[PDB]
Amino acid sequence: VGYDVIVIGGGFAGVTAAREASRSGLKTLILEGRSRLGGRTFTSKLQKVELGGTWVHWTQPNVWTEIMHYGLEVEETVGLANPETVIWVTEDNVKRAPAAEAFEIFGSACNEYYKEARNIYPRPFEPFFERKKLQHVDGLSAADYLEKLPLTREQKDMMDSWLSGNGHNYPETIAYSEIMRWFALSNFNMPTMFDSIARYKIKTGTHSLLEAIMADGNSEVKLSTPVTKVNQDKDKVTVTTEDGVFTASAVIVAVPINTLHDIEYSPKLSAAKVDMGSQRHAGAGVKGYIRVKQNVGNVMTYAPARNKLTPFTSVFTDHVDESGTLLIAFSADPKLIDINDIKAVEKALQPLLPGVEVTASYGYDWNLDPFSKGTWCTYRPNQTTRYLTELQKREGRLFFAGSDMANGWRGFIDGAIENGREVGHQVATYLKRE
Amino acid sequence: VGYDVIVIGGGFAGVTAAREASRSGLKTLILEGRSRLGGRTFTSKLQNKVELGGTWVHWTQPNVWTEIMHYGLEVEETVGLANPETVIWVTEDNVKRAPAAEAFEIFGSACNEYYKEARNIYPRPFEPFFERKKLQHVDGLSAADYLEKLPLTREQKDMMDSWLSGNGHNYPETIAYSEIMRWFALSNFNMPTMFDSIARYKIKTGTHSLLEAIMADGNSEVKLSTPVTKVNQDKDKVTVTTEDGVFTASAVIVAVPINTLHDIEYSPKLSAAKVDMGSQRHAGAGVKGYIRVKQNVGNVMTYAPARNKLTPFTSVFTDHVDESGTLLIAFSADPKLIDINDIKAVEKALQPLLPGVEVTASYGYDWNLDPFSKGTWCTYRPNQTTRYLTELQKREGRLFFAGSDMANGWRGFIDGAIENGREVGHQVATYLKREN
Ligand SMILES: Cc1cc2nc3c(=O)[nH]c(=O)nc-3n(C[C@H](O)[C@H](O)[C@H](O)COP(=O)(O)OP(=O)(O)OC[C@H]3O[C@@H](n4cnc5c(N)ncnc54)[C@H](O)[C@@H]3O)c2cc1C
Ligand SMILES: Cc1cc2nc3c(=O)[nH]c(=O)nc-3n(C[C@H](O)[C@H](O)[C@H](O)COP(=O)(O)OP(=O)(O)OC[C@H]3O[C@@H](n4cnc5c(N)ncnc54)[C@H](O)[C@@H]3O)c2cc1C
């Protein structure tokens, strides 16, 4: 064998696993399909901006541990956690109110929608602590549950906006239990949830953290080297790529679950990987940055995934400077809006911010990038209880890792780091046992 | 030089630092004065397994929770403090008892007033001086100073006194108000999460199991029962003198409790912050003990102010109830008030809180008189945060410093030790790599 460990995928999961493995003394190679590391995090420059994963918080043990580990610093996005004005669409009409006034409505709705989170996920990092209680509800979509609640249509519409934002899809495709999971990870507190999901970002960019972790390790890296076949025998794994064939005692498959079909495995992978590679998680929407000429202040908008007025489930202020306001925008379906068509985005903004002039608009297409085939991972109904454990399971000398199968903040950067660290430790232990 | 890194102290901070450094390829030696690793964590047996020091953890604690998951460890629950059935409390020399919810009405109203400014002082609890000016304005207050300015009943004030004395492990006028604020801010500004964070979850296999996993993931030599006496540094090396040998390294990580700083002779002498903290000490100076009573008392939680005429204990709560009766955890603000290892004295002291209990067993480790700790967990006195934290953390030549006593976040906790040790170990690895 040429290597002790080969890691397929150079996202945070694969990089963290490679650090764990190499620092334990194992000869490790990273094979990365793109011409860059980072995967679904991508720090670039527009005119330095984050084209993918962005926000972090100290409710996320691993990513915060690493940030402090390397002396990085964080800045604030203002719009979601501390807006001045809240705009929301209900029954195809647009309402606007002081943030406190809007959050009365939205928070009462939340009190209703999250009432069972404590019963389902008392230990958010131990998914199956309440296996029976979770199994009883895992068949519910976010919409299925919403419609059972005693709320006004307005409350339901705000919750629709919120849940569609969380799952990055229409609410009937997103698992209700996953919504509960987010709430429980935020210490069963709505303010803590807002602070955790869209407020703090690494001052020097996610790439700086990724690089600190890589420098802390001792792994070889081959970029622009897509893996095509993985063959496993009793002694080794043979990983075939477009640019060479490599052998290792153990291989950590750290690719997006939505891409599992894209490699030929012998033996074939278990039915859980096959089923999730077929169905995919729910993350399949649009995220974009919009520069507007006007100074609109700190706004937060809510619109149902399906409404007659705007394609955006939410838009909010990132920051306001001399050039106007930078907004972050989410939509549940790229069929609704071309986030890179400036005139289309401007039109889509008119009902929420009448009169805004779009100076610029950009969004990376994670859905059609063959190396992601989607955005951040949120399970569809039934997927947690059916597949999580089966997804994590090692198969022979093949190990599996990623936020897409993390126990806690699955779907976040923190999930990638947590899962990669544990899986790398397991791989090192396995090799020591032999 | 004999080593790249010598780590003085085999607590969680030093153990984490030693892992960080050795896994970076550096030849690392740990020197530990006691005959064991763990420092102020000590997993022992009381009639066959108890934690005599650091015990409770939570996922609001990034480093220790990261490590717990890293190694696949599990947690159990202490029931008494976070989910009692009955709360007993002492106010104005009276003892009241009520269903937990009723007691928490009073205690929670008091808390709502006492913590109202935490958000303004520590918006980023892991970044101590983010709001430096606001913190400097209040850092001169003791917990008692602030309490007496509040619009509360004497009952509310007495419950708050109990709580603040429990947190600081000392009398409330010795504890910094800002430190109380920090605990609240680290608990995400909500009392339920604070209760869950400070006394609820414990590692099923004991703190030593995590300490051992960290050590096994590393590659460092260990010398136990080898107290350091002198540390001398020049431009090229550090010479560390112990009772059992002399060792040299390019860099030395000093990971001892600040309360012990005076006990090693440093040449050149250390900066004024280290000396001032070794003189003044943090506030942690109380009693912690395990008590077995024959009776099944249920899940109780008690509150008594640090100075009261009824009992020496600031709080007692149920750890668990099994066939042998009730195991309770007891805290006192002053070792002069109760001999935690005198069974009859403890039984007497418990009578007003749990009238009729028969004490079958009682044990508490004396961290105050142990020369290797000289105190319990670190909570700063007034002024100490803003005057000393940064200078305490400062590297001096080839000397680096680490410990829970100087962490940015959960300072005073296991999480703080792991966090600070990781940062300092990474800094040492960087420094030594640069020299090559
Ligand atoms: C639009 C968007 C916004 C987000 N915002 C946030 C946020 O604010 N906060 C947050 O915490 N998270 C956010 N996330 C989620 C976060 O970015 C990801 O969950 C995390 O980066 C996933 O890391 P990973 O290592 O598990 O997988 P990935 O990052 O997807 O890494 C997988 C890697 O494998 C490579 N690969 C795939 N197939 C092959 C192959 N055959 N051969 C070789 N290499 C291959 C890919 O190129 C990629 O480099 C966001 C995600 C999206 C899509
Ligand atoms: C009673 C009590 C209860 C606690 N409960 C909790 C809890 O529930 N949860 C929590 O998170 N934290 C708790 N803590 C705090 C926690 O135990 C400590 O904060 C943490 O262990 C600090 O570790 P450290 O590595 O920074 O220093 P320490 O663990 O104190 O160890 C420093 C080491 O230096 C060694 N040393 C000292 N002098 C010398 C010398 N001259 N030569 C060589 N070695 C030397 C010591 O022997 C020791 O091993 C508690 C503390 C106490 C006292």
Short mmCIF file of all heavy atoms in Angstrom, two decimals, chain B residues 72-92, unseen atoms left out:
data_model
loop_
_atom_site.label_atom_id
_atom_site.label_comp_id
_atom_site.label_asym_id
_atom_site.label_seq_id
_atom_site.Cartn_x
_atom_site.Cartn_y
_atom_site.Cartn_z
N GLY B 72 -15.76 9.51 22.01
CA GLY B 72 -16.90 8.64 22.21
C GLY B 72 -17.29 8.36 23.65
O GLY B 72 -17.84 7.29 23.93
N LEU B 73 -17.03 9.30 24.56
CA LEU B 73 -17.44 9.13 25.95
C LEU B 73 -18.91 9.52 26.13
O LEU B 73 -19.53 10.13 25.27
CB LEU B 73 -16.54 9.96 26.87
CG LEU B 73 -15.06 9.58 26.81
CD1 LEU B 73 -14.21 10.42 27.76
CD2 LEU B 73 -14.92 8.10 27.12
N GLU B 74 -19.46 9.15 27.29
CA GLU B 74 -20.88 9.36 27.59
C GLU B 74 -21.04 10.11 28.91
O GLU B 74 -20.11 10.19 29.72
CB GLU B 74 -21.63 8.03 27.65
CG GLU B 74 -21.63 7.29 26.33
CD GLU B 74 -22.24 5.91 26.45
OE1 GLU B 74 -23.14 5.72 27.30
OE2 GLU B 74 -21.81 5.01 25.70
N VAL B 75 -22.25 10.65 29.12
CA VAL B 75 -22.55 11.41 30.33
C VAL B 75 -23.76 10.82 31.04
O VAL B 75 -24.64 10.21 30.43
CB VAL B 75 -22.77 12.91 30.04
CG1 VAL B 75 -21.48 13.56 29.55
CG2 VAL B 75 -23.89 13.12 29.03
N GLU B 76 -23.76 10.99 32.36
CA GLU B 76 -24.87 10.77 33.28
C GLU B 76 -25.32 12.10 33.86
O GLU B 76 -24.66 13.13 33.68
CB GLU B 76 -24.48 9.85 34.45
CG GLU B 76 -23.85 8.53 34.11
CD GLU B 76 -23.26 7.87 35.34
OE1 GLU B 76 -22.86 8.60 36.27
OE2 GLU B 76 -23.21 6.63 35.38
N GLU B 77 -26.40 12.05 34.64
CA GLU B 77 -27.03 13.26 35.16
C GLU B 77 -27.04 13.27 36.68
O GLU B 77 -27.44 12.29 37.31
CB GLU B 77 -28.45 13.40 34.60
CG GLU B 77 -28.47 13.57 33.08
CD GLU B 77 -29.87 13.78 32.52
OE1 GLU B 77 -30.74 14.29 33.27
OE2 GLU B 77 -30.09 13.46 31.34
N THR B 78 -26.62 14.39 37.24
CA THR B 78 -26.90 14.75 38.63
C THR B 78 -28.27 15.42 38.67
O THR B 78 -28.56 16.29 37.84
CB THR B 78 -25.84 15.70 39.18
OG1 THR B 78 -24.55 15.05 39.16
CG2 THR B 78 -26.17 16.13 40.60
N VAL B 79 -29.12 14.98 39.60
CA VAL B 79 -30.52 15.36 39.57
C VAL B 79 -30.82 16.57 40.45
O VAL B 79 -31.74 17.35 40.16
CB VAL B 79 -31.40 14.17 39.98
CG1 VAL B 79 -32.86 14.59 40.06
CG2 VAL B 79 -31.21 13.02 39.02
N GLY B 80 -30.05 16.74 41.53
CA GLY B 80 -30.51 17.59 42.62
C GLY B 80 -30.63 19.06 42.25
O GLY B 80 -31.62 19.71 42.61
N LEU B 81 -29.63 19.61 41.58
CA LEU B 81 -29.60 21.06 41.39
C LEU B 81 -30.50 21.51 40.24
O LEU B 81 -31.25 22.48 40.39
CB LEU B 81 -28.16 21.53 41.15
CG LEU B 81 -28.02 23.05 41.11
CD1 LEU B 81 -26.76 23.51 41.83
CD2 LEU B 81 -28.05 23.55 39.68
N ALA B 82 -30.44 20.82 39.10
CA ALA B 82 -31.17 21.28 37.93
C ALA B 82 -32.63 20.87 37.95
O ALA B 82 -33.47 21.53 37.33
CB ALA B 82 -30.50 20.78 36.65
N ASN B 83 -32.98 19.77 38.64
CA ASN B 83 -34.36 19.28 38.67
C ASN B 83 -34.72 18.73 40.04
O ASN B 83 -35.08 17.56 40.18
CB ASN B 83 -34.56 18.23 37.58
CG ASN B 83 -34.49 18.82 36.19
OD1 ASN B 83 -33.43 18.81 35.56
ND2 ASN B 83 -35.60 19.38 35.73
N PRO B 84 -34.70 19.57 41.07
CA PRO B 84 -35.13 19.12 42.39
C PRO B 84 -36.65 19.08 42.47
O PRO B 84 -37.37 19.75 41.72
CB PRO B 84 -34.56 20.19 43.33
CG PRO B 84 -34.53 21.42 42.49
CD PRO B 84 -34.18 20.95 41.10
N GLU B 85 -37.13 18.29 43.43
CA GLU B 85 -38.55 18.30 43.77
C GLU B 85 -38.84 19.33 44.84
O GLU B 85 -39.82 20.08 44.75
CB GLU B 85 -39.00 16.92 44.24
N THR B 86 -37.97 19.40 45.85
CA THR B 86 -38.13 20.34 46.95
C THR B 86 -36.90 21.23 47.04
O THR B 86 -35.76 20.78 46.84
CB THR B 86 -38.35 19.61 48.28
OG1 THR B 86 -39.43 18.68 48.12
CG2 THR B 86 -38.69 20.59 49.38
N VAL B 87 -37.14 22.51 47.30
CA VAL B 87 -36.09 23.48 47.54
C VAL B 87 -36.23 23.96 48.97
O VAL B 87 -37.33 24.29 49.42
CB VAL B 87 -36.14 24.65 46.53
CG1 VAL B 87 -35.14 25.73 46.92
CG2 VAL B 87 -35.83 24.14 45.13
N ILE B 88 -35.12 23.94 49.70
CA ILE B 88 -35.04 24.42 51.07
C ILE B 88 -34.10 25.62 51.09
O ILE B 88 -33.04 25.59 50.46
CB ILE B 88 -34.53 23.32 52.03
CG1 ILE B 88 -35.42 22.08 51.93
CG2 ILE B 88 -34.47 23.83 53.46
CD1 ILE B 88 -34.66 20.81 51.62
N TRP B 89 -34.48 26.67 51.79
CA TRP B 89 -33.63 27.86 51.83
C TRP B 89 -33.70 28.58 53.17
O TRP B 89 -34.72 28.56 53.86
CB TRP B 89 -33.98 28.83 50.68
CG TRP B 89 -35.31 29.52 50.76
CD1 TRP B 89 -35.54 30.79 51.19
CD2 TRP B 89 -36.58 28.99 50.36
NE1 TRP B 89 -36.89 31.08 51.10
CE2 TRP B 89 -37.54 29.99 50.59
CE3 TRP B 89 -36.99 27.76 49.83
CZ2 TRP B 89 -38.89 29.81 50.31
CZ3 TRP B 89 -38.34 27.58 49.55
CH2 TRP B 89 -39.27 28.60 49.80
N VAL B 90 -32.58 29.21 53.50
CA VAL B 90 -32.36 29.91 54.76
C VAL B 90 -32.38 31.41 54.51
O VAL B 90 -31.58 31.91 53.71
CB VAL B 90 -31.03 29.49 55.40
CG1 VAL B 90 -30.63 30.47 56.49
CG2 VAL B 90 -31.11 28.07 55.93
N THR B 91 -33.30 32.12 55.16
CA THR B 91 -33.30 33.58 55.11
C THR B 91 -33.62 34.16 56.48
O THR B 91 -34.59 33.75 57.11
CB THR B 91 -34.30 34.08 54.05
OG1 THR B 91 -34.40 35.51 54.11
CG2 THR B 91 -35.67 33.45 54.26
N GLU B 92 -32.81 35.12 56.93
CA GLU B 92 -32.99 35.78 58.23
C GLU B 92 -33.11 34.79 59.38
O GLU B 92 -33.88 34.98 60.31
CB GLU B 92 -34.20 36.70 58.22
CG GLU B 92 -33.98 38.07 57.63
CD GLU B 92 -35.24 38.61 57.01
OE1 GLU B 92 -35.71 38.01 56.03
OE2 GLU B 92 -35.77 39.62 57.53
#
